[PDB]
């Protein structure tokens, strides 16, 4: 999910990954990647009506994001309003107002996120300092020190705020394995399965639309088989991905999707209508790459687990784990840090108190001096009546006199 309101505190004139209610007054739109939770309001009728009444508002995103977005027929009205920006290329954006001729320049830099085709970061630099928006990123430990654009002369830049992805910001997802390990496990399993007979097929229950192209491409390169998907016209301008997918159902590896694909697999049938070739039945096994299932285990588990006679689960996460998030935020050391999404189990307060010790808040101060005036006793209640005998005791000490005047 995306708990972001698509509006930074430093630059409220730009909205990122959210165009629902208050972002209709923004001067520039930014899109991290092409996931549905980061595209709320992008197809709204009010936004459609606003686009046809303005000329200076644009939608900035990665070129791969533009290719994936313009392929959908529902978003083709953005064809003349999308401006793609290369990664690691500092460009100047003009936040010109429509009504008044006022203008404001800001410098944005796109950084790779390693999440899905077209996923990038947004690094803004303007009058209110430097802010960073890492929407659904994935960085291993020790990789934050390798980003060239986040360093200024060998040291980390002065970052004011970080709107980081906190999908797995909880002690349950302590150290998620790298995607290479899950890839190797899935490759070994699929090889050992399909190497027996040409009728052994492997399903890949991939929930997200984008993010699993790495697995498909590497399985195709290591097995020579082409994965089956529903639609592949979206990758028509991406040769390195298009030549690994196929619409034909006569392939072994499959990654097709369907709302009722579970019952179909239970009936020994892929999501595609084909259930057998040449009237010879097919032997199907299901591999579901996910991460939330592994975050609920109670003992030592493996990357490739077997939950049934023809069912498997793989730990394939496109989100940074708790340790990776902590390492990234501690290396950046920003003034503030806001969670974009709250975990299902965790709440807002726990994520906030986890992220706070990592922020650059190393500034303490002694409490303000509370004055003490007008003492709480006016009259001397401890006064004596001065009745004595004056003979049992020695003479009183005479009052001293001091005439020195410096």
């Amino acid at each position: 999910m995306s708990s972001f309101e698509g509006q930074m505190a430093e630059y409220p004139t730009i909205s990122i990954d959210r165009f629902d209610r208050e972002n209709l007054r923004a001067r520039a739109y930014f899109l991290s990647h092409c996931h549905k939770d980061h595209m709320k309001g992008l197809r709204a009728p009010t936004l459609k009506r606003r686009l046809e009444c303005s000329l200076k508002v644009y939608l900035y995103c990665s070129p791969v994001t533009k290719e994936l977005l313009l392929t959908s027929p529902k978003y083709r009205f953005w064809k003349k309003r999308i401006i793609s920006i290369e990664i690691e290329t500092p460009t100047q954006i003009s936040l010109v107002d429509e009504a008044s001729g006022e203008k404001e320049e800001i410098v944005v830099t796109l950084l790779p996120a390693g999440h899905c085709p077209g996923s990038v970061m947004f690094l803004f630099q303007g009058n209110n300092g430097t802010v960073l928006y890492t929407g659904d990123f994935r960085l291993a430990q020790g990789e934050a020190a390798r980003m060239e654009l986040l360093h200024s002369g060998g040291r980390v830049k002065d970052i004011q705020s970080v709107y980081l992805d906190t999908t797995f910001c909880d002690p349950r997802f302590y150290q998620i394995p790298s995607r290479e390990e899950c890839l190797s496990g899935v490759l070994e399993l699929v090889r050992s399965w399909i190497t027996r007979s040409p009728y052994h097929v492997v399903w890949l229950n991939c929930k997200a639309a984008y993010g699993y192209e790495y697995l498909f491409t590497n399985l195709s390169e290591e097995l020579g088989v082409q994965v089956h998907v529903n639609k592949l016209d979206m990758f028509r301008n991406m040769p390195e991905i298009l030549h690994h997918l196929t619409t034909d159902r006569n392939t072994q590896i499959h990654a097709c999707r369907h709302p009722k694909a579970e019952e179909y697999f239970q009936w020994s049938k892929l999501p595609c209508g084909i259930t057998s070739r040449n009237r010879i039945p097919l032997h199907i096994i299901s591999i579901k790459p996910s991460t939330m299932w592994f975050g609920e285990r109670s003992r030592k588990t493996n990357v490739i687990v077997r939950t049934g006679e023809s069912s498997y689960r793989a730990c394939f996460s496109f989100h940074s784990s708790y340790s990776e998030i902590k390492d990234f935020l501690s290396y950046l050391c920003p003034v503030n840090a806001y969670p974009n999404v709250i975990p299902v189990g965790t709440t807002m307060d726990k994520v906030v108190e986890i992220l706070k010790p990592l922020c650059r808040s190393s500034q303490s101060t002694e409490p303000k001096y509370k004055p003490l005036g007008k003492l709480k006793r006016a009259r001397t209640v401890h006064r004596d009546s001065e009745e004595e005998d004056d003979y049992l005791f020695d003479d009183p000490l005479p009052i001293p006199l001091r005439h020195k005047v410096p």
Binding site: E5, R21, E22, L24, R25, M348, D349, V352
Partner: protein, 90 residues
């Protein structure tokens, strides 16, 4: 507003001043944003002292939510605002 020590109070003051911004849609959006902000702020509160302070501020008879809805009921532009107010009150 200068009352930034307790963000709830300044949020309520800005929400009250919103009703005088010629009853426009942009004012409605700003008011809805302020309402959601003050709601998510009052929800995360856990200490009972600041909790009582916030529940006394939001139900005040000068800039509270009830007087805000009672005076904004004649304006159709603040439909989502009253809905979010009622949801936060629930």
């Amino acid at each position: 507003m200068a009352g930034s020590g307790a963000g709830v109070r300044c949020s309520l003051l800005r929400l009250q001043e919103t009703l005088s911004a010629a009853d426009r849609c942009g004012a409605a959006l700003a008011g809805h944003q302020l309402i959601r902000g003050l709601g998510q702020e009052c929800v995360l509160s856990s200490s009972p002292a600041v909790l009582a302070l916030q529940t006394s501020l939001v139900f005040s008879r000068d800039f509270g939510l009830l007087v805000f809805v009672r005076k904004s009921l004649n304006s159709i532009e603040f439909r989502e605002c009253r809905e979010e107010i009622l949801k936060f009150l629930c």
